[PDB]
Amino acid sequence: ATVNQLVRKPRARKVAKSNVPALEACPQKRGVCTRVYTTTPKKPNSALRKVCRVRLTNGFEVTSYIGGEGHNLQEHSVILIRGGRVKDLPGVRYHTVRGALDCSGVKDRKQARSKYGVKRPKA
Amino acid sequence: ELQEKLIAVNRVSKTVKGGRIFSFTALTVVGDGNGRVGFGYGKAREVPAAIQKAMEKARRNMINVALNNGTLQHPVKGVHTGSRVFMQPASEGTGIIAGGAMRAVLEVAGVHNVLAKAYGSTNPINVVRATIDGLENMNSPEMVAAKRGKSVEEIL
Amino acid sequence: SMQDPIADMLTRIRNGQAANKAAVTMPSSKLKVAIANVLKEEGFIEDFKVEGDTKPELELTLKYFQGKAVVESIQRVSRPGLRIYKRKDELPKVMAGLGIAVVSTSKGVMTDRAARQAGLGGEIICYVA
Amino acid sequence: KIRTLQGRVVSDKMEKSIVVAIERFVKHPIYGKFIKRTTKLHVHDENNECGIGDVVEIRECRPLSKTKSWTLVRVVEKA
Amino acid sequence: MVTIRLARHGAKKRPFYQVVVADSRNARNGRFIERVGFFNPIASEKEEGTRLDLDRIAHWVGQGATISDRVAALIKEVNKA
Amino acid sequence: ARYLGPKLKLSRREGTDLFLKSGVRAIDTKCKIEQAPGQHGARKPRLSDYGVQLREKQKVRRIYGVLERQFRNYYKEAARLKGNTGENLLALLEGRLDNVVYRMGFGATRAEARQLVSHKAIMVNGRVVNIASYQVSPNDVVSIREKAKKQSRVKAALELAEQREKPTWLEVDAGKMEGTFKRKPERSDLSADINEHLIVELYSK
RNA sequence: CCCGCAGAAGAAGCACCGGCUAACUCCGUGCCAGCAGCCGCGGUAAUACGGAGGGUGCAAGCGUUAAUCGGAAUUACUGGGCGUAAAGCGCACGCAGGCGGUUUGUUAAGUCAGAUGUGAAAUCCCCGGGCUCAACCUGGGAACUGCAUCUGAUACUGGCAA
RNA sequence: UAGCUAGUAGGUGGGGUAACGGCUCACCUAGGCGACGAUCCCUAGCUGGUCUGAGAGGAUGACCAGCCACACUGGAACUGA
Ligand SMILES: [Mg+2]
Ligand SMILES: [Mg+2]
Ligand SMILES: [Mg+2]
Ligand SMILES: [Mg+2]
Ligand SMILES: [Mg+2]
Ligand SMILES: [Mg+2]
Ligand SMILES: [Mg+2]
Ligand SMILES: [Mg+2]
Ligand SMILES: [Mg+2]
Ligand SMILES: [Mg+2]
Ligand SMILES: [Mg+2]
Ligand SMILES: [Mg+2]
Ligand SMILES: [Mg+2]
Ligand SMILES: [Mg+2]
Ligand SMILES: [Mg+2]
């Protein structure tokens, strides 16, 4: 644009939103598993992804993926969730931190234990 | 004797009645390390053959760069297709600060310290052509003074 | 309408060098004559002459070296829509020193190196390279 | 010499007062253009003689009313 | 009363006082009017471990500034030298 | 904070000796320097430009026993200093007290010199320094303490050093066991296989 | 802080290894279990899942998440575009606004130069000094792109008069 | 979010403050501000600076320092320099 046009109407930024708005700029949030279940992903992938409908402390009702090889999350479980969506799942924008409050660690991991809340097996 | 550098090996393909014919393209640059650089682009059904064709084309097509102490003479802009590049001289120790294709071009041309950015598209072929255009349109104090009809000191 | 004769002069010179015209002719002005003085004395043109007392017509002879033009680039910086004034310690460099920056200082039209010599700032009329 | 300004009268409806529009010439911080900006100062006017559209020369003084801290010194021209 | 005193800077266990002329109400390391020198209590030898600007200090005392006790001792020692 | 692993694996990766062993014997009879370590050693590695820059940085770091955070501080300081950044970085690396001890020959290797430094067996200008990263300035007299002059380590180190090249910018004695650090070594004086503009470009990335 | 003691003696883990991106093969699983930042991977020979060996990076830390800037010339003042990719109002007139041909004179607002006053200290930067080095703390400088006057120049813009 | 303002804008006179002042009162004028964004609405302590950036900028103002505001909420004044 011309300089006069820019003076009259300056350049506008792009505000941007959060891919994880229910976190409310907090790295983790404590939520209650109002539901635990499985869902099938988008094509071309096919499997039974494990998810939970969680009620966070800020009142948000969200859906959170559960990683790891098998969980032990029944309803009313107190879990801690973090950001980072799952691509093949529609709208699932959060993970549950394994090994946090109730979402206990994956049984029998050896690599990347810190990502799944597994304490170091004895040498 | 001439320093060779392979930049990109890209698999193209044309479609025919039977199906698809997958060929290969090779982009290379040759440079003696002292202001004589050229680039070559060669196609062949096989990667080594394409590389050799690029090598021959690059050796056959070189240009003169009026280097100054292993760095550029003045800020320059290289414009080709959808690729614009900016190159600026730097005091020694800076090294080469450029992208992929530009790094190859400058390393083989013999520039040792330069700052550079690549705006627009970053397609290696057009980046190379723009960089070479910028170098071949970069002047030197001696010939600038010559064309203006003055002496080097009278210019700087 | 013609709202920048200085840009007109620079554009005439640029187009003439592009089209290999030997001389480019235009209406004259005090400022145009001063800029022609600067360009001539730093060797970007041979000669210039202003003929006429009611409609002064200025003629600039362009120079080409080995066939190529000499004025490879010539840009109007401080245009009417955005005047540019620089201080003696932010006077620009053109071609990292090889080029010139025609600057109108308080003592007349005179290049950036001369302005840095005489400790002056002023209006950056144009860049020449 | 005392600090002062010079502006253009835009209204004299006030009794013993005038409103003076003073235009300043500020280079824009971002875009580098020199833009016109005009400030309006309620100028005290004893006697009340200045008209709408005259160039008057004014000086800051003590507060005089709610929004009148400036006052006349002389009238540069009549319009 | 405007007082000439020591504002402690430095780090832990290693003080370094700045002799400042300040209103006696402000905080110790707070607003001052002028910095007239410094004093290093753990000053290693060979280094000028104490420097006062006696002309400015005398200016302030003439203006009526009061002098703290440690600053008075420093002035005595520096003018003794 | 120290690479307490096998040493010759580093030399095998970089393809060249880093003097990580004493030098009593050629390293060829101690490791397959030609072969990179691990199950896939004979594999022919096509390295990228980032590969070239990364390996160069590692090589020099491993030579001096420097870790990445400290080496980045060195690079920042070298860039900040006037002149050529690459040679300034090499000079700062050479100024390390452990490296100065190594060059002066009180340690057969830089790890040995580092342990001598860290066990308070070294003085600088008379004061004991046990900082393995202490920066030795011009004209300093790096010495060995009397209670540590009797260690066979220092002797064997001196007779191992004598059969190598003698750093010009140093003056060492075997009797008094001192050394004057005359000047800062120059990029020209140091080994020419180190190609430091790769480090410069890497950290400019 | 200095000296003495006894003995390697009390002290290494985390992430990753398909490309981006440094680092690769076996076994288990069989579009399942699962991974995932994107491209994507997994359907009986998986360097992409899980385990093992090997390796890479960093290191008393290592990753994940949250957040900001960068890359992003992706709001382009420096530094972008508008025939077909998003983008010339359907076309005109026209107030405010933006810009303004040419010569002489005058003014000194813009502009430039110089000086003065301030622009707190710290922080950033430069030259040094001190804590065994560094972090840290300091001395001096530079800088704080500014603003207000005053004195000059007045080429260019502005005013004013021809 | 396009019109807002009735002590509202100005004048005179009286009162009031440590001090100029619609600060307050009576009267007399009908003004004042706004497209260079008034009024309204939503967030927000401000700065030196911090983070990032080649830089211009962008984001933010934790610690430290300067200024302001507040002290359960809403108001008042008293003593006091
Ligand atoms: Mg550490
Ligand atoms: Mg790789
Ligand atoms: Mg298998
Ligand atoms: Mg940007
Ligand atoms: Mg575009
Ligand atoms: Mg279309
Ligand atoms: Mg279109
Ligand atoms: Mg049309
Ligand atoms: Mg004109
Ligand atoms: Mg300051
Ligand atoms: Mg004029
Ligand atoms: Mg608030
Ligand atoms: Mg940028
Ligand atoms: Mg409370
Ligand atoms: Mg009282």
Strands (E) in chain A, as ranges, are 28-39, 49-56, 61-65, 78-83, 94-96
Residue B108 (CA) to nucleotide G37 (C1'), in angstroms, measures 35
CB of F5 within 7 Å of some strand G atom: yes
- Asked whether residue C16 falls in the same domain as residue C3, the answer is yes
Rounded Cα distance between A55 and C9, Å, is 73
B97 phi-psi bin (left φ>0, alpha ψ -120 to 50, beta other)? beta
CB contact under 8 A, A3 and D35: no
The CATH code of the domain that includes A32 is 2.40.50.140
**Contact B97/B116 with Cβ under 8 angstroms?**
yes
How many structural domains compose chain C? 2
Burial of D74 (0-12, 13-18, 19+ CB in 10 A): exposed
Choose the closest CB to C65 out of B73, B147, B155.
Answer: B147
CATH 1.10.1050.10 spans which residues of chain F?
7-93+190-203
**Contact F204/B96 with Cβ under 8 angstroms?**
no
Residue F34 (CA) to nucleotide G11 (C1'), in angstroms, measures 35
The CATH code of the domain that includes C128 is 3.30.1490.10
Stated in angstroms to one decimal place, the resolution of this structure is 3.1
The number of residues in chain B equals 156
Burial of F150 (0-12, 13-18, 19+ CB in 10 A): exposed
Q: Which class does domain F94-181 fall in? A: alpha beta
D and C adjacent (3 or more CB pairs under 8 angstroms): yes
**Contact E36/E68 with Cβ under 8 angstroms?**
no
**Residue C6 domain boundaries:** 1-71
Strands (E) in chain F, as ranges, are 122-124, 127-128, 141-144, 170-172, 178-181
* Contact status of A2 with chain C (Cβ, < 8 Å): yes
The ligand whose atoms approach the alpha carbon of F50 most closely is: 2
Rounded Cα distance between F83 and F87, Å, is 8
Rounded Cα distance between F24 and D58, Å, is 94
Burial of F56 (0-12, 13-18, 19+ CB in 10 A): buried
Cis preceding-peptide flag for A44 (omega within 30 of 0): yes
Q: C51, C71, C91: which is the final residue of a domain? A: C71
The CATH code of the domain that includes C65 is 3.30.1370.30
CB contact under 8 A, F86 and B96: no
CB contact under 8 A, B93 and F88: yes
Rounded Cα distance between F109 and F21, Å, is 6
CATH number for the domain running over F7-93+190-203: 1.10.1050.10
Residue B115 (CA) to nucleotide H54 (C1'), in angstroms, measures 10
The number of residues in chain A equals 123
Question: Within 13 Å of residue B55, how many CA atoms lie on the same side as its CB?
Answer: 11
Do the bridges between strand B114-120 and strand C45-51 make them parallel or antiparallel, or are there none, so unpaired?
Answer: unpaired
- Domain spanning D1-79: CATH 3.40.30.10: no
